[PDB]
Amino acid sequence: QFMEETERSLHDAIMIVRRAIKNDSVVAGGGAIEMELSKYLRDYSRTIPGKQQLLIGAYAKALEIIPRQLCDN
Amino acid sequence: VLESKSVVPGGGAVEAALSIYLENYATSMGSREQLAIAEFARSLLVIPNTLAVNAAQDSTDLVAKLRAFHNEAQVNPERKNLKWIGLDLSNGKPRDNKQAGVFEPTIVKVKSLKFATEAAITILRIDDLIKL
């Protein structure tokens, strides 16, 4: 049961290791950026809206679902 | 007015500010407390909402404007862009505080605030209607 996820771990690196090469420009993983991106738009949920702060908040809501999907799963 | 000198300008500009002002107060926290402030502030805007709703107008259009009216949070006509300003009691469109704008006395809110929160924690306690 153990062996394969290693072999998968090997191919995972070479992908994103080369992808660390592929795109030089890199952001912190684990949904790190999407967190403030919620604020940044919920800033605009504050900032601009005639209405769409709903839209802007609904959008910004979609950001952190993944680390929420990650930590909670 | 005269016996209660301390009053808060606006009834809906105080509302969408407290959304943000608490959202910020929420944003500072984390954990449950960031939520524990958030949906409290998400209990607010309905107050100007049912207003323009009952005015046959779009409160979301109106309340997001007050939400859009800010830099930091406060209610003044002074900077009506960079802060909140007043309210329209027939609409919910922010009115210049001193001119058409709302003012609310000090106790009007602190009392209106807590009781709903008092009522909120109340039902929250009750899971059992149990009978014979």
Swiss-Prot record, chain A:
Covalent cross-link site, Glycyl lysine isopeptide (Lys-Gly) (interchain with G-Cter in SUMO2): K51
UniProt: ATP binding residues: R19, G30
Positions with a binding annotation for ADP: G30
Signal peptide extent: none
Subcellular location: Cytoplasm
Function summary: Component of the chaperonin-containing T-complex (TRiC), a molecular chaperone complex that assists the folding of actin, tubulin and other proteins upon ATP hydrolysis. The TRiC complex mediates the folding of WRAP53/TCAB1, thereby regulating telomere maintenance.
Assigned protein family: Belongs to the TCP-1 chaperonin family.
Subunit structure of this chain's protein: Component of the chaperonin-containing T-complex (TRiC), a hexadecamer composed of two identical back-to-back stacked rings enclosing a protein folding chamber. Each ring is made up of eight different subunits: TCP1/CCT1, CCT2, CCT3, CCT4, CCT5, CCT6A/CCT6, CCT7, CCT8. Interacts with PACRG. Interacts with DLEC1.
Disease: De novo genetic variants in nearly every subunit of the TRiC complex, including CCT7, have been found in individuals with a broad spectrum of brain malformations, and clinical phenotypes ranging from mild to severe epilepsy, developmental delay, intellectual disability, ataxia, and other features of cerebral malfunction.
Name of the protein: T-complex protein 1 subunit eta
Species of provenance: Homo sapiens
Gene this protein is translated from: CCT7
From-to range in the entire protein, with total length: 380 to 452 of 543
UniProtKB/Swiss-Prot annotation, chain B:
Keywords associated with the record: Acetylation, ATP-binding, Chaperone, Cytoplasm, Cytoskeleton, Disease variant, Epilepsy, Hydrolase, Intellectual disability, Nucleotide-binding, Phosphoprotein
Binding site for ADP: G11, E104
Keyword presence, Thylakoid: no
N6-acetyllysine found at: K93
Keyword Hydrolase part of the UniProt annotation: yes
GO molecular-function terms, A-Z: ATP binding; ATP hydrolysis activity; ATP-dependent protein folding chaperone; protein folding chaperone; RNA binding; ubiquitin protein ligase binding; unfolded protein binding
Modified residues (Phosphoserine): S90
GO biological process: binding of sperm to zona pellucida; chaperone mediated protein folding independent of cofactor; chaperone-mediated protein folding; positive regulation of establishment of protein localization to telomere; positive regulation of protein localization to Cajal body; positive regulation of telomerase RNA localization to Cajal body; positive regulation of telomere maintenance via telomerase; protein folding
One Gene Ontology cellular component: chaperonin-containing T-complex
Source domain of life: Eukaryota
Location relative to the cell: Cytoplasm, Cytosol; Cytoplasm, Cytoskeleton, Microtubule organizing center, Centrosome
Subunit structure of this chain's protein: Component of the chaperonin-containing T-complex (TRiC), a hexadecamer composed of two identical back-to-back stacked rings enclosing a protein folding chamber. Each ring is made up of eight different subunits: TCP1/CCT1, CCT2, CCT3, CCT4, CCT5, CCT6A/CCT6, CCT7, CCT8. Interacts with PACRG. Interacts with GBA1. Interacts with DLEC1.
Family that this chain belongs to: Belongs to the TCP-1 chaperonin family.
Involvement in disease: Intellectual developmental disorder with polymicrogyria and seizures: An autosomal dominant neurologic disorder characterized by a broad phenotypic spectrum. Main clinical features are developmental delay of varying severity, intellectual disability, seizures, and polymicrogyria. Additional variable features are non-specific pyramidal or cerebellar signs, and visual impairment.
Cited function: Component of the chaperonin-containing T-complex (TRiC), a molecular chaperone complex that assists the folding of actin, tubulin and other proteins upon ATP hydrolysis. The TRiC complex mediates the folding of WRAP53/TCAB1, thereby regulating telomere maintenance. As part of the TRiC complex may play a role in the assembly of BBSome, a complex involved in ciliogenesis regulating transports vesicles to the cilia.
Protein name as catalogued: T-complex protein 1 subunit alpha
Lineage: Eukaryota, Metazoa, Chordata, Craniata, Vertebrata
